[PDB]
PDB file of C-alpha atoms in Angstrom:
ATOM      1  CA  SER A 723      98.040  80.069 130.137  1.00 55.80           C
ATOM      2  CA  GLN A 724      97.263  77.556 127.601  1.00 56.08           C
ATOM      3  CA  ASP A 725     100.089  79.649 125.063  1.00 54.20           C
ATOM      4  CA  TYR A 726     102.818  79.851 128.310  1.00 52.24           C
ATOM      5  CA  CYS A 727     102.413  75.961 129.071  1.00 53.11           C
ATOM      6  CA  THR A 728     102.984  75.902 125.401  1.00 51.79           C
ATOM      7  CA  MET A 729     106.240  78.398 125.255  1.00 53.71           C
ATOM      8  CA  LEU A 730     107.259  76.183 127.785  1.00 53.38           C
ATOM      9  CA  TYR A 731     107.018  72.958 126.364  1.00 55.93           C
ATOM     10  CA  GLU A 732     109.843  74.447 123.114  1.00 57.32           C
ATOM     11  CA  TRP A 733     112.030  76.033 124.986  1.00 57.04           C
ATOM     12  CA  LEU A 734     112.376  72.750 127.517  1.00 58.48           C
ATOM     13  CA  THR A 735     112.321  70.639 124.277  1.00 57.50           C
ATOM     14  CA  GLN A 736     113.941  72.690 121.875  1.00 60.07           C
ATOM     15  CA  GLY A 737     115.768  75.423 123.182  1.00 62.56           C
ATOM     16  CA  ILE A 738     113.488  77.612 120.927  1.00 64.31           C
ATOM     17  CA  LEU A 739     113.126  81.715 122.138  1.00 61.83           C
ATOM     18  CA  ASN A 740     110.347  83.150 120.571  1.00 62.79           C
ATOM     19  CA  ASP A 741     108.913  86.020 122.943  1.00 60.72           C
ATOM     20  CA  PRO A 742     107.655  88.607 121.254  1.00 61.30           C
ATOM     21  CA  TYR A 743     105.737  90.435 124.313  1.00 64.05           C
ATOM     22  CA  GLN A 744     108.142  89.819 126.728  1.00 61.97           C
ATOM     23  CA  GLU A 745     106.280  86.831 128.659  1.00 56.72           C
ATOM     24  CA  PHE A 746     108.745  84.263 128.742  1.00 55.27           C
ATOM     25  CA  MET A 747     111.147  83.941 131.732  1.00 53.95           C
ATOM     26  CA  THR A 748     114.414  83.720 129.596  1.00 54.43           C
ATOM     27  CA  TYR A 749     115.881  85.357 126.622  1.00 53.89           C
ATOM     28  CA  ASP A 750     118.992  85.212 125.066  1.00 55.49           C
ATOM     29  CA  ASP A 751     121.041  88.376 123.010  1.00 52.43           C
ATOM     30  CA  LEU A 752     122.258  88.248 119.802  1.00 51.96           C
ATOM     31  CA  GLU A 753     118.627  88.321 119.133  1.00 53.25           C
ATOM     32  CA  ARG A 754     131.378  86.754 123.134  1.00 55.82           C
ATOM     33  CA  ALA A 755     130.852  86.757 119.317  1.00 55.42           C
ATOM     34  CA  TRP A 756     129.514  83.307 120.055  1.00 54.95           C
ATOM     35  CA  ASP A 757     128.459  82.673 123.588  1.00 54.50           C
ATOM     36  CA  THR A 758     125.410  85.123 123.770  1.00 53.00           C
ATOM     37  CA  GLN A 759     124.136  86.380 127.719  1.00 54.75           C
ATOM     38  CA  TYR A 760     120.982  84.167 128.998  1.00 53.51           C
ATOM     39  CA  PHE A 761     119.330  86.986 131.064  1.00 52.05           C
ATOM     40  CA  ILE A 762     116.196  85.503 133.506  1.00 48.48           C
ATOM     41  CA  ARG A 763     113.240  87.752 133.720  1.00 50.56           C
ATOM     42  CA  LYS A 764     112.149  87.772 137.570  1.00 50.96           C
ATOM     43  CA  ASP A 765     109.073  89.943 136.878  1.00 49.47           C
ATOM     44  CA  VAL A 766     107.444  87.114 134.940  1.00 51.65           C
ATOM     45  CA  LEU A 767     108.622  84.219 136.673  1.00 48.87           C
ATOM     46  CA  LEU A 768     106.298  81.194 137.598  1.00 48.30           C
ATOM     47  CA  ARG A 769     107.773  80.741 141.075  1.00 49.52           C
ATOM     48  CA  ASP A 770     109.575  82.580 143.521  1.00 50.48           C
ATOM     49  CA  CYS A 771     113.260  81.174 142.653  1.00 48.47           C
ATOM     50  CA  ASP A 772     114.627  82.079 146.280  1.00 50.67           C
ATOM     51  CA  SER A 773     115.122  79.179 147.621  1.00 51.98           C
ATOM     52  CA  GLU A 774     117.995  76.781 147.217  1.00 51.67           C
ATOM     53  CA  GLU A 775     115.668  73.913 145.462  1.00 54.92           C
ATOM     54  CA  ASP A 776     113.554  76.459 142.913  1.00 54.90           C
ATOM     55  CA  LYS A 777     117.439  78.169 141.912  1.00 55.30           C
ATOM     56  CA  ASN A 778     118.872  74.884 140.938  1.00 56.70           C
ATOM     57  CA  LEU A 779     115.470  74.096 139.129  1.00 60.26           C
ATOM     58  CA  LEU A 780     115.441  77.100 136.999  1.00 60.61           C
ATOM     59  CA  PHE A 781     119.391  76.947 136.463  1.00 60.76           C
ATOM     60  CA  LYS A 782     118.834  72.912 135.613  1.00 59.08           C
ATOM     61  CA  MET A 783     116.000  74.652 132.818  1.00 58.70           C
ATOM     62  CA  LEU A 784     118.186  77.391 131.797  1.00 59.28           C
ATOM     63  CA  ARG A 785     120.876  74.719 131.206  1.00 61.29           C
ATOM     64  CA  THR A 786     118.270  72.532 129.138  1.00 61.96           C
ATOM     65  CA  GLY A 787     117.420  75.124 126.870  1.00 59.76           C
ATOM     66  CA  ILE A 788     120.930  76.261 126.620  1.00 60.04           C
ATOM     67  CA  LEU A 789     122.110  72.917 125.437  1.00 57.51           C
ATOM     68  CA  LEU A 790     119.413  72.345 123.218  1.00 58.42           C
ATOM     69  CA  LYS A 791     120.076  75.976 121.532  1.00 57.22           C
ATOM     70  CA  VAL A 792     123.974  74.639 121.389  1.00 56.45           C
ATOM     71  CA  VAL A 793     122.987  71.198 119.914  1.00 57.35           C
ATOM     72  CA  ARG A 794     120.167  73.346 117.058  1.00 58.09           C
ATOM     73  CA  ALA A 795     123.217  75.582 116.240  1.00 59.55           C
ATOM     74  CA  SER A 796     125.780  73.544 115.804  1.00 60.48           C
ATOM     75  CA  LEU A 797     123.573  70.434 113.824  1.00 59.95           C
ATOM     76  CA  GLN A 798     122.350  73.286 111.579  1.00 59.28           C
ATOM     77  CA  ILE A 799     118.690  72.111 112.017  1.00 59.14           C
ATOM     78  CA  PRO A 800     115.792  74.364 113.245  1.00 57.72           C
ATOM     79  CA  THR A 801     114.426  71.748 115.414  1.00 59.36           C
ATOM     80  CA  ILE A 802     115.183  68.547 117.252  1.00 59.18           C
ATOM     81  CA  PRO A 803     113.160  65.677 116.335  1.00 60.18           C
ATOM     82  CA  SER A 804     112.025  63.219 119.387  1.00 61.89           C
ATOM     83  CA  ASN A 805     113.541  59.769 117.221  1.00 62.46           C
ATOM     84  CA  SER A 806     117.386  61.333 118.407  1.00 61.60           C
ATOM     85  CA  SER A 807     116.769  59.906 121.654  1.00 64.20           C
ATOM     86  CA  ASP A 808     115.044  57.577 124.344  1.00 62.72           C
ATOM     87  CA  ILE A 809     113.300  60.244 125.907  1.00 63.07           C
ATOM     88  CA  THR A 810     109.666  61.998 124.825  1.00 59.65           C
ATOM     89  CA  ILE A 811     108.207  64.867 126.636  1.00 63.27           C
ATOM     90  CA  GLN A 812     104.368  65.732 126.873  1.00 60.53           C
ATOM     91  CA  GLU A 813     103.210  69.367 126.684  1.00 62.94           C
ATOM     92  CA  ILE A 814     101.856  71.005 129.371  1.00 64.85           C
ATOM     93  CA  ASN A 815      97.989  71.171 129.330  1.00 67.89           C
ATOM     94  CA  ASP A 816      96.922  72.184 133.119  1.00 64.80           C
ATOM     95  CA  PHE A 817      98.943  74.924 134.346  1.00 61.73           C
ATOM     96  CA  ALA A 818      97.568  74.671 137.676  1.00 59.86           C
ATOM     97  CA  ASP A 819      97.802  70.849 138.174  1.00 60.98           C
ATOM     98  CA  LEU A 820     101.785  71.206 137.479  1.00 62.31           C
ATOM     99  CA  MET A 821     102.493  73.968 139.562  1.00 63.23           C
ATOM    100  CA  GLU A 822     100.978  72.061 142.767  1.00 65.88           C
ATOM    101  CA  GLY A 823     102.397  68.960 141.222  1.00 71.03           C
ATOM    102  CA  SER A 824     105.260  67.262 141.053  1.00 69.30           C
ATOM    103  CA  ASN A 825     104.687  66.541 137.206  1.00 68.57           C
ATOM    104  CA  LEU A 826     106.518  69.874 136.355  1.00 68.15           C
ATOM    105  CA  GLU A 827     109.714  68.487 137.939  1.00 65.90           C
ATOM    106  CA  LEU A 828     109.625  65.092 136.409  1.00 68.04           C
ATOM    107  CA  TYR A 829     109.230  66.594 132.860  1.00 71.47           C
ATOM    108  CA  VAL A 830     112.205  68.788 133.440  1.00 70.58           C
ATOM    109  CA  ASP A 831     114.552  66.797 134.773  1.00 71.42           C
ATOM    110  CA  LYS A 832     113.684  63.951 131.764  1.00 69.98           C
ATOM    111  CA  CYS A 833     114.005  66.808 129.513  1.00 73.39           C
ATOM    112  CA  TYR A 834     117.361  67.774 130.913  1.00 72.27           C
ATOM    113  CA  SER A 835     118.642  64.284 131.141  1.00 68.91           C
ATOM    114  CA  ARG A 836     117.671  64.074 127.470  1.00 69.55           C
ATOM    115  CA  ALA A 837     119.898  66.815 126.498  1.00 72.18           C
ATOM    116  CA  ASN A 838     122.888  66.062 128.912  1.00 70.38           C
ATOM    117  CA  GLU A 839     123.018  62.693 127.126  1.00 68.91           C
ATOM    118  CA  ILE A 840     122.549  64.388 123.674  1.00 66.48           C
ATOM    119  CA  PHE A 841     125.408  66.922 124.406  1.00 66.70           C
ATOM    120  CA  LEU A 842     127.377  64.307 125.629  1.00 63.90           C
ATOM    121  CA  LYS A 843     127.241  61.739 122.645  1.00 61.29           C
ATOM    122  CA  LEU A 844     127.522  64.908 120.563  1.00 59.33           C
ATOM    123  CA  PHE A 845     130.880  66.128 122.048  1.00 61.28           C
ATOM    124  CA  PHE A 846     132.026  62.250 122.346  1.00 61.18           C
ATOM    125  CA  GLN A 847     131.355  61.183 118.941  1.00 60.21           C
ATOM    126  CA  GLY A 848     131.831  63.913 116.927  1.00 59.28           C
TER     127      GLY A 848
ATOM    128  CA  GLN B 636     138.946  71.054 108.753  1.00 60.44           C
ATOM    129  CA  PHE B 637     139.634  74.452 111.208  1.00 63.42           C
ATOM    130  CA  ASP B 638     139.816  77.839 109.469  1.00 62.04           C
ATOM    131  CA  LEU B 639     142.750  79.793 111.293  1.00 64.64           C
ATOM    132  CA  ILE B 640     142.866  83.946 110.914  1.00 66.78           C
ATOM    133  CA  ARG B 641     146.344  85.636 112.028  1.00 68.90           C
ATOM    134  CA  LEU B 642     146.102  89.430 113.355  1.00 70.55           C
ATOM    135  CA  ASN B 643     148.667  91.741 113.323  1.00 71.07           C
ATOM    136  CA  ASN B 644     149.535  91.352 116.942  1.00 73.19           C
ATOM    137  CA  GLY B 645     150.377  87.969 116.687  1.00 74.25           C
ATOM    138  CA  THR B 646     146.598  86.541 117.526  1.00 71.16           C
ATOM    139  CA  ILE B 647     145.037  83.625 116.026  1.00 71.69           C
ATOM    140  CA  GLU B 648     141.059  83.018 115.448  1.00 73.24           C
ATOM    141  CA  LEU B 649     138.705  80.637 114.281  1.00 71.81           C
ATOM    142  CA  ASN B 650     136.854  81.211 111.425  1.00 70.26           C
ATOM    143  CA  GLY B 651     132.712  80.509 111.725  1.00 70.07           C
ATOM    144  CA  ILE B 652     131.429  77.692 113.600  1.00 67.60           C
ATOM    145  CA  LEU B 653     133.915  74.406 114.534  1.00 68.06           C
ATOM    146  CA  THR B 654     132.026  71.397 112.754  1.00 69.54           C
ATOM    147  CA  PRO B 655     132.474  68.263 114.280  1.00 69.67           C
ATOM    148  CA  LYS B 656     134.233  65.171 113.059  1.00 71.26           C
ATOM    149  CA  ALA B 657     131.909  63.951 110.735  1.00 70.92           C
ATOM    150  CA  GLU B 658     129.627  62.786 112.694  1.00 69.18           C
ATOM    151  CA  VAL B 659     125.263  63.232 113.330  1.00 65.53           C
ATOM    152  CA  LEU B 660     122.957  61.199 114.861  1.00 63.93           C
ATOM    153  CA  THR B 661     121.650  58.807 111.866  1.00 62.66           C
ATOM    154  CA  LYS B 662     119.828  56.058 113.545  1.00 62.42           C
ATOM    155  CA  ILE B 663     128.652  65.217  95.977  1.00 61.89           C
ATOM    156  CA  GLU B 664     132.207  67.077  94.554  1.00 64.03           C
ATOM    157  CA  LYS B 665     132.698  70.740  96.479  1.00 61.09           C
ATOM    158  CA  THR B 666     133.432  72.380  92.357  1.00 60.84           C
ATOM    159  CA  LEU B 667     133.343  76.335  92.309  1.00 60.84           C
ATOM    160  CA  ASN B 668     131.036  77.777  90.186  1.00 60.34           C
ATOM    161  CA  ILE B 669     131.749  80.979  87.802  1.00 59.33           C
ATOM    162  CA  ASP B 670     131.997  83.523  90.720  1.00 64.05           C
ATOM    163  CA  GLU B 671     134.019  81.607  92.964  1.00 63.30           C
ATOM    164  CA  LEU B 672     136.203  81.059  90.343  1.00 68.04           C
ATOM    165  CA  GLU B 673     136.589  84.433  89.503  1.00 68.49           C
ATOM    166  CA  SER B 674     137.131  85.186  93.054  1.00 74.50           C
ATOM    167  CA  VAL B 675     140.212  82.572  93.753  1.00 72.56           C
ATOM    168  CA  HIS B 676     141.177  83.851  90.814  1.00 71.63           C
ATOM    169  CA  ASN B 677     141.379  87.618  92.077  1.00 73.24           C
ATOM    170  CA  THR B 678     142.848  86.163  95.088  1.00 70.39           C
ATOM    171  CA  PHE B 679     145.718  84.997  93.476  1.00 70.37           C
ATOM    172  CA  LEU B 680     146.860  87.643  91.902  1.00 69.05           C
ATOM    173  CA  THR B 681     146.451  90.004  94.822  1.00 65.03           C
ATOM    174  CA  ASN B 682     148.295  87.166  96.370  1.00 60.89           C
ATOM    175  CA  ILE B 683     151.216  87.587  93.538  1.00 61.10           C
ATOM    176  CA  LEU B 684     150.953  91.327  93.713  1.00 59.39           C
ATOM    177  CA  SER B 685     151.058  91.605  98.342  1.00 59.17           C
ATOM    178  CA  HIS B 686     155.004  90.237  97.668  1.00 55.42           C
ATOM    179  CA  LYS B 687     157.360  92.212  99.245  1.00 55.34           C
ATOM    180  CA  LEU B 688     159.697  92.739  96.526  1.00 57.55           C
ATOM    181  CA  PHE B 689     156.647  92.949  93.907  1.00 58.45           C
ATOM    182  CA  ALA B 690     154.874  95.734  96.474  1.00 61.14           C
ATOM    183  CA  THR B 691     156.401  98.897  94.642  1.00 63.53           C
ATOM    184  CA  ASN B 692     155.799 102.156  95.881  1.00 63.46           C
ATOM    185  CA  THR B 693     153.931 100.889  98.220  1.00 67.32           C
ATOM    186  CA  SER B 694     153.330 102.571 102.137  1.00 67.24           C
ATOM    187  CA  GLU B 695     153.210  99.219 103.872  1.00 67.85           C
ATOM    188  CA  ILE B 696     156.701  98.143 103.112  1.00 67.11           C
ATOM    189  CA  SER B 697     159.796  98.698 104.793  1.00 68.85           C
ATOM    190  CA  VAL B 698     162.748 100.624 103.297  1.00 67.86           C
ATOM    191  CA  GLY B 699     166.204  98.759 103.875  1.00 67.87           C
ATOM    192  CA  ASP B 700     168.446  99.961 106.288  1.00 66.50           C
ATOM    193  CA  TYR B 701     171.434 102.563 105.532  1.00 64.77           C
ATOM    194  CA  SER B 702     169.947 102.816 101.792  1.00 65.31           C
ATOM    195  CA  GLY B 703     166.293 104.721 102.811  1.00 63.35           C
ATOM    196  CA  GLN B 704     165.214 103.114  99.357  1.00 62.23           C
ATOM    197  CA  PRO B 705     162.475 100.506  99.280  1.00 66.43           C
ATOM    198  CA  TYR B 706     163.423  96.968  98.254  1.00 67.45           C
ATOM    199  CA  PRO B 707     162.013  97.088  94.510  1.00 67.83           C
ATOM    200  CA  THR B 708     163.251 100.493  94.250  1.00 66.10           C
ATOM    201  CA  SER B 709     167.095  99.089  94.927  1.00 68.64           C
ATOM    202  CA  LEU B 710     166.042  95.964  92.194  1.00 68.27           C
TER     203      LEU B 710
END
């Protein structure tokens, strides 16, 4: 799962979607002209996403990735450097530890707050 | 900074991406080259041509009422 954790970190820090094997739990269309549809794949999920808490967590991660991709497309930059904000996300190393601990939720909330702050600053100043 | 496009049904659509009002997180002249100048000259020429009074023997123009003849033909 070293590859899956890196893909999740890339999706949660830059919103870049690179799933050439249909393994990631989220993928967007246009791979209506400007607004693309984001489909969540339930066959390759990491949790059940049936309870309200898990659904809200998945929606928060998806919104973080969407905001990251939108910021990238607006700034015409290939990636969002970490110096653009005061929030830094650490890469996942142990998938079992990330699943069993609240570090996953902590990192998700951190990157979500970072993406929301960046989006608000951009749409308020530019 | 906003590029609009009109349609036959009276709707207006924004062309391309809407750039922000010159604000990038940071903590010369836009001149036209050979092909751009030639293309803009061609657009100027076709805009001169597309005048209703200059559109002679065209299907897009409407003839004058009670006459049955287009405006350039009557001219």
